[PDB]
Amino acid sequence: MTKQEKTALNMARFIRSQTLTLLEKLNELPGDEQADICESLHDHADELYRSCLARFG
Amino acid sequence: MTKQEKTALNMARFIRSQTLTLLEKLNELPGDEQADICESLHDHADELYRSCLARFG
Numbered sequence: 354m355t356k357q358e359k360t361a362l363n364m365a366r367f368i369r370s371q372t373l374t375l376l377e378k379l380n381e382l383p384g385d386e387q388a389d390i391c392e393s394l395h396d397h398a399d400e401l402y403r404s405c406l407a408r409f410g
Numbered sequence: 411m412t413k414q415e416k417t418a419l420n421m422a423r424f425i426r427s428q429t430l431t432l433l434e435k436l437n438e439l440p441g442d443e444q445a446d447i448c449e450s451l452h453d454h455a456d457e458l459y460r461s462c463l464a465r466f467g
Contacts, residue, residue: 355439357435357438357439358439358441360435361432361435361436361439361441361444364428364431364432364435365432365444365448367428368425368428368429368432368451371421371424371425371428372425374421375418375421375422375425378414378417378418378421379418379462381414382414382415382418384462384465386461386465387418387458387461387462387465390454390457390458390461391422391458393454394425394451394454394455394457394458397447397450397451397454398451400447401444401447401448401451404441404443404444404447405436405441405444408441408443408444409439409441
């Protein structure tokens with residue numbers, strides 16, 4: 354892959370990790386709706402990372 | 411807000427920003443499907459930020 358592809362792939366991996374850290378923090382707070390939306394956002398960020406891994410790798 | 415709530419709200423805001431920065435990078439690359447997934451991810455991140463702002467403020 355190109356260096357610009359590698360940088361985009363690394364950034365998608367970072368957003369996947371950031372949404373998991375946010376889900377961990379929202380899981381310890383009483384707002385179920387925010388934790389449910391974050392769980393879905395995290396799944397979505399993992400879908401973007403896997404799509405980039407498949408396309409560029 | 412509690413310190414846990416402030417960190418969660420600020421991380422939701424940061425993920426909303428970072429997904430727009432990743433979209434701009436994917437739009438410079440040949441992965442059109444990845445850009446479309448990221449644009450939806452950015453809208454999703456804004457859904458979560460708005461939900462946390464309404465729940466914590």
